[PDB]
C-alpha cells in the first residue's frame, strides 16, 4: 500500500463535494493537513503525525549529499545541445573592500549576465513544473540541497549548496500560498489568529517609504548618528522639529528606514517631546517588531541550550546570530565563527578595529578610504537588538 500525508492542494481550485454531511470548525488546524487517519486491521482508526514519523527525519543519512553529489558528478553536463543555456556561471572570488568605488567599474561594461539555475527554477507555476517543458528538472536532486552545475575556470563542475532555510525551496515545490497558510498555522499556535490592530500604522508606513517627497536629511543624519545614544540627545529638538513640521505639512513620516532610528526615537523620546499619536506610531512599529520576533521564536519550546547555542537559534535564522542584517551599524556580541573580511584576510580578533571620539584622530579621518583598518563603534551589539535589526 502507498498513501500520502501532508499534501497541499491547489487553493485556486478549492472544491468541496460534500457540503452536507460535514461542516468543520473554521480553525486552521482543520484547514491544513498535518496528520493522516488510517485504519487498523480491525475497523479502528489510527492517527499518524509527523512526530510519529520522527525516527526517519532526524537520521544522519538525510542530511548529506555525498553519494548524491558523487553520482551527480559521475554524469555531468546534459548531452542535449539545446540544454546549453543553464550551465553558465561566473562564480569567482576577489577582494571585496575596494568594491565601493569599483561598483561603477562593473557596469562600465555593457555585457549581460546569463541567468542562474535558481532564477531559472522559481519562474514556473505549481502544476506545469512537473512537465517536460521545464528544462532544469534534473537539478532538483534533494529536498534540502541545491545541485547546481555550471562553469568554474573553463571547467563545468557540479556544486552542491544546502538550502539553509525553507525559503530556499522553490515555489514550484512549495508555493507562496502554502507559506502564508503556514504563517496562519503558527499564528494560531501562539494565540494570535486575531492579531492586534496595526493596519493604519503600516498603511502610513507603506505610503511614507515609497513617496518621492521623502526628505534628504534622513539619509545624512542617519550616516551621522548610527545609533550612538549621546549623539541623538544633541539632535533632540531638531528631530522634534523634523517630526512635527514634516508630518504637519506632509502626511508621510520621516526616519522610516533605519532600524537604529526607530529603536531609538521610540525609546528616547517617550517623555512627551512630540504629539502623542506619532509616539504611538513608533511604538506600534516596534510592537510589530516584538510580535514578529515572538512569531520567529517558538516560546513554549525554547528552553535549554545545545552545543553552546540557544535552542531558539537552531530553528530560525532570525535568532541564529550567524545571519547578519544587510545594514550593519554595530558589530555583534557573539562572534564565535564569523570570519569578517574586507579585502583579503579575515579580521577576526580585536587587533585591528579601534576608534575614539572627541580626541579627533586625524589618522582615522585621513585613512577613511584605507578600508583595511576599519573603525568599529566599540559597542558590541547585544543579541536582542541583533535579532530585531535582522527583522
Amino acid at each position: 500500500f502507498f498513501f500520502p500525508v501532508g499534501l497541499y492542494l491547489p487553493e485556486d481550485r478549492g472544491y468541496t463535494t460534500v457540503e452536507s454531511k460535514v461542516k468543520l470548525n473554521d480553525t486552521v488546524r482543520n484547514a491544513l493537513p498535518t496528520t493522516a487517519y488510517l485504519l487498523n486491521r480491525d475497523r479502528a482508526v489510527q492517527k499518524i503525525d509527523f512526530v510519529d514519523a520522527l525516527k526517519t527525519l532526524c537520521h544522519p543519512v538525510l542530511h548529506e549529499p555525498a553519494p548524491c553529489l558523487q553520482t551527480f558528478t559521475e554524469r555531468g553536463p546534459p548531452s542535449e545541445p539545446a540544454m546549453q543555456r543553464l550551465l553558465e556561471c561566473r562564480f569567482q572570488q576577489e577582494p571585496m573592500g575596494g568594491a565601493a568605488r569599483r561598483i561603477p567599474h562593473f557596469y562600465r561594461v555593457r555585457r549581460e549576465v546569463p541567468r542562474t539555475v535558481n532564477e531559472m527554477k522559481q519562474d514556473f507555476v505549481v502544476t506545469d513544473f512537473y512537465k517536460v517543458g521545464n528544462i532544469t528538472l534534473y537539478t532538483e536532486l534533494h529536498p534540502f540541497f541545491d545541485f547546481t552545475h555550471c562553469q568554474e575556470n573553463s571547467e563545468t563542475v557540479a556544486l552542491c549548496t544546502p538550502r539553509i532555510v525553507i525559503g530556499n525551496l522553490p515555489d514550484g515545490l512549495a508555493p507562496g500560498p502554502f507559506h502564508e497558510l503556514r504563517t496562519w498555522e503558527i499564528m494560531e499556535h501562539m494565540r494570535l489568529r486575531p492579531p492586534p490592530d496595526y493596519e493604519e500604522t503600516l498603511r502610513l508606513f507603506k505610503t511614507t517609504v515609497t513617496s518621492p517627497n521623502y526628505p534628504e536629511l534622513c539619509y545624512l543624519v542617519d550616516v551621522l548618528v548610527h545609533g550612538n545614544v549621546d549623539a541623538f540627545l544633541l539632535i533632540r529638538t531638531f528631530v522634534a522639529r523634523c517630526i512635527v513640521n514634516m508630518f504637519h505639512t506632509r502626511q508621510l513620516l520621516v526616519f522610516a528606514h533605519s532600524y537604529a532610528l526607530v529603536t531609538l526615537i521610540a525609546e528616547h523620546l517617550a517623555d512627551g517631546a512630540l504629539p502623542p499619536q506619532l509616539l504611538f506610531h513608533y511604538r506600534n512599529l516596534v510592537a510589530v517588531l516584538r510580535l514578529v520576533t515572538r512569531i520567529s521564536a517558538l516560546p513554549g519550546l525554547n528552553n535549554g541550550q545545545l552545543a553552546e547555542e540557544p535552542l531558539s537559534a537552531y530553528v530560525n535564522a532570525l535568532h541564529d546570530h550567524r545571519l547578519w542584517p544587510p545594514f550593519v551599524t554595530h558589530l555583534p556580541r557573539n562572534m564565535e565563527g564569523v570570519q569578517v573580511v574586507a579585502d583579503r584576510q579575515p579580521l577576526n580578533p580585536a587587533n585591528i578595529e579601534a576608534r575614539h571620539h572627541g580626541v579627533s584622530d586625524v589618522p582615522r579621518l585621513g585613512a577613511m578610504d584605507a578600508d583595511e583598518p576599519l573603525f568599529v563603534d566599540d559597542y558590541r551589539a547585544t543579541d536582542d537588538e541583533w535579532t530585531l535589526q535582522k527583522v
Binding site: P81, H105, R108, V109, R110, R111
Partner: protein, 69 residues
Amino acid sequence: SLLHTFWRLPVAVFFEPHEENVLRCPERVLRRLLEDAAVTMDRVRKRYLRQELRDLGHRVQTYCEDLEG
C-alpha cells in the same frame, strides 16, 4: 591590417559549430568589444622612510630631555 590568405577564392560554409570554428562577427559587435575592452583597465614609501627618520630625531630629542630631566 588585412591578412594575406593563401587560398585565392573564398570557400562556402554550411558547417554546424560543433564541426568547426568560424569568425562570422560584424564590425558593430567588435566596436562594442573595443568599448568594453579599452575602459576595463612610489615616492610615498621613501617619504615614510624620511618620516621614520624624523621620528628618530623625535625620540633622540626626547631622550636628551630624559638625560636632562
